[PDB]
C-alpha cells in the first residue's frame, strides 16, 4: 500500500543520485512539485510531437504515464543516462529528496488520482531478457511502487513468442481496450530491455448531452476541405474563457469534480499550430485560472482518439541518447543492459454519456429562458484537449481533435 506510506517507511535509494549544477489545498508539498514537472515536459513533449506530425492528425497520450514509466529507469540510471533523463523529463527541477524518491512521489501523485464515479485504468510494465540477472531490490521496489517488478522474458530465441506475451498482458488489463502494443516486427532477437504504459479513462459527464440532440454537421479540417461529424449539444454553466486572440478555453467536468476535460478552441482565422507553439506551462495555467462560470451554448464532436507510438524517436530527438544507447547505456541498477524500445498507447472516447460509456440518457429542462445574447463554444474545427485533475492541475491526458469524422 505505497499510498498510504512514507518514504523512509520502506527504504528505496537509487544507487546514483544526480546534483544539477502556492500549494493546494490538503495536498502534500512533494507531489505538487513533482506534478508541475510533468506538466513542464508535457508541454515540450507535446509540441515536439505535433511538430513532427500532419495538422490532419489527431493525437493523444499519457505524458504523466510516460513520466512514470521513465521514472523507473531514473531509478537505476547513472551518469550522462541519468543527467539526460533528468534534463529531459524536468526532474532536474525539483528538490533533492523528492528527486532521489522520485520513483515514489510518482506512486504517490497517482495514487491521489487514482483514488478519484470515474476509474482511470492502465497497464504499464517492464520486459527484460531473462538471460539476464536482475538486481533484485530494484525488482522490490518496483514491485511496490509501479505495480509490479520487471517481468523477464526470452527475446534472445522467443522473439515473437515473448513479443505476444506481451501484448496478451496488456489486453488482460485493459478489458480489450489496448491490443497489439506492440506492433509485429517491434521486438526481435537483441532486444533486451522494453518499456510498455497503456492507459485510457473511464468516466460520465457531470453534464450530459442528449443523443436526441445530436446532428450531422460539417467540420473544417486543417488542410481546407470539410467533413461530417456527429456534433453534440447543450445548454448550461461551465468555467469558460475567451482569451488572447480569441482563443476559447472551456472545461466540461466529469462526475466527481476531480478530474475534467479542457478543450482550447482558437478562432476560425488563427491555425492551431500557432496555439500549439505559444503553449507553455504558464500560458496555460493561466487560462484556466481567468475560467470564469457562465451559461453557454456547447456544440462539440463525438470523437475517439487513439495514438500507440514509439517513444524513442521522439525522446532522442529531445536528448534522451544513452538511454537507448548499446554503448552509452548506464543502468547499473538494473542489472551491459539498454532501453531498446519504449511504446505508449492510450485512446479517448467521448460520447453523449461521457469517456467510455456504453448507455444513454435523455433529457428533459422544463421552465429554461437563456439570455439570447448568449455564448456558443462551437468546436467545429481543430481543438486541443487536456484531461486533468483539479486542484492540483495535473496533466493526466492530453492531445488533439484535428479530425472526429468518418
Ligand atoms: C538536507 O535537506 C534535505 O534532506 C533531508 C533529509 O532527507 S532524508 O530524510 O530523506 O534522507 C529532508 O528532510 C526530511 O524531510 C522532511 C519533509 O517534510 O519532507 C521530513 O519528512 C517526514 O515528515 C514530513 C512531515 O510529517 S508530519 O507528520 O509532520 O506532517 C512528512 O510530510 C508530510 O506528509 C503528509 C502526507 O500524508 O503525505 C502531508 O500531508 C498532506 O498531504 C496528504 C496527501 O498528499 S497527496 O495525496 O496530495 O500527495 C493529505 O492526505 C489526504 C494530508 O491531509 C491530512 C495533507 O496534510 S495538509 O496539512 O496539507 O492537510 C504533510 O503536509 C504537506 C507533509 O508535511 C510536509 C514526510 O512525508 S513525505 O513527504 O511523504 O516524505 C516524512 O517523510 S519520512 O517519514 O519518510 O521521513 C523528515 O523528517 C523525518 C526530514 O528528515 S530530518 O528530520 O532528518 O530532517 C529535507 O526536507 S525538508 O526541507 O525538511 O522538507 C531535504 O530538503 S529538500 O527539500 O529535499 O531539499
Ligand atoms: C542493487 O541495487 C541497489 C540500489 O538500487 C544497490 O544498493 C544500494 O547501495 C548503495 C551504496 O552501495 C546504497 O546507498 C543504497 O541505499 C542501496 N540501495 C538500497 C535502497 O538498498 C545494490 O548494491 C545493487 N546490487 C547489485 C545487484 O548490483
Ligand atoms: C559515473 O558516475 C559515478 C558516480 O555515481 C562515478 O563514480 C563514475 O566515475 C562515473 N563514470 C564512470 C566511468 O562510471
Not at 210 to 219: D, G, H, Y
Not at 313 to 339: A, C, N, R, T, W
Request: hydrophobic share 40%.
Amino acid at each position: 500500500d505505497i499510498c498510504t506510506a512514507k518514504p523512509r517507511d520502506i527504504p528505496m535509494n537509487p544507487m546514483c543520485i544526480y546534483r544539477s549544477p502556492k500549494i493546494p489545498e490538503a495536498t502534500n508539498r512533494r507531489v505538487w512539485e513533482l506534478s508541475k514537472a510533468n506538466s513542464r515536459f508535457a508541454t515540450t513533449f507535446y509540441q515536439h510531437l505535433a511538430d513532427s506530425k500532419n495538422d490532419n492528425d489527431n493525437i493523444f497520450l499519457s505524458p504523466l504515464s510516460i513520466s512514470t514509466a521513465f521514472a523507473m529507469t531514473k531509478l537505476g540510471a547513472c551518469n550522462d543516462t541519468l543527467q539526460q533523463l533528468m534534463e529531459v523529463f524536468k526532474f532536474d527541477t525539483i528538490s533533492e529528496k523528492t528527486s532521489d524518491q522520485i520513483h515514489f512521489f510518482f506512486a504517490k501523485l497517482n495514487c491521489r488520482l487514482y483514488r478519484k464515479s470515474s476509474k482511470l485504468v492502465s497497464a504499464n510494465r517492464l520486459f527484460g531478457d531473462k538471460s539476464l540477472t536482475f538486481n533484485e531490490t530494484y525488482q522490490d521496489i518496483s514491485e511496490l511502487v509501479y505495480g509490479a517488478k520487471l517481468q523477464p522474458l526470452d527475446f534472445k530465441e522467443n522473439a515473437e513468442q515473448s513479443r505476444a506475451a506481451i501484448n496478451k498482458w496488456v489486453s488482460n488489463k485493459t478489458e480489450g481496450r489496448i491490443t497489439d502494443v506492440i506492433p509485429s516486427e517491434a521486438i526481435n532477437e537483441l532486444t533486451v530491455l522494453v518499456l510498455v504504459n497503456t492507459i485510457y479513462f473511464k468516466g460520465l459527464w457531470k453534464s450530459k448531452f442528449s443523443p436526441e440532440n445530436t446532428r450531422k454537421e460539417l467540420f473544417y479540417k486543417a488542410d481546407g476541405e470539410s467533413c461530417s461529424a456527429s456534433m453534440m449539444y447543450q445548454e448550461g454553466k461551465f468555467r469558460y474563457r475567451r482569451v488572447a486572440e480569441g482563443t476559447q478555453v472551456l472545461e466540461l467536468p466529469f462526475k466527481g469534480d476531480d478530474i475534467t476535460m479542457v478543450l482550447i478552441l482558437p478562432k476560425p482565422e488563427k491555425s492551431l499550430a500557432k496555439v500549439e507553439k505559444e503553449l507553455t506551462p504558464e500560458v496555460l495555467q493561466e487560462w484556466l485560472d481567468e475560467l470564469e462560470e457562465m451559461m453557454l451554448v456547447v456544440h462539440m464532436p463525438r470523437f475517439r482518439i487513439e495514438d500507440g507510438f514509439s517513444l524513442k524517436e521522439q525522446l532522442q530527438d529531445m536528448g534522451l541518447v544513452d538511454l537507448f544507447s548499446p554503448e552509452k547505456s548506464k543502468l547499473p541498477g538494473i542489472v551491459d543492459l539498454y532501453v531498446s524500445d519504449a511504446f505508449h498507447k492510450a485512446f479517448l472516447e467521448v460520447n453523449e454519456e461521457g469517456s467510455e460509456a456504453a448507455a444513454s440518457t435523455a433529457v428533459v429542462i422544463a421552465g429554461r429562458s437563456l439570455n439570447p445574447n448568449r455564448v456558443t463554444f462551437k468546436a467545429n474545427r481543430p481543438f486541443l484537449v487536456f484531461i486533468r485533475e483539479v486542484p492540483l492541475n495535473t496533466i493526466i491526458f492530453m492531445g488533439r481533435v484535428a479530425n472526429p469524422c468518418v
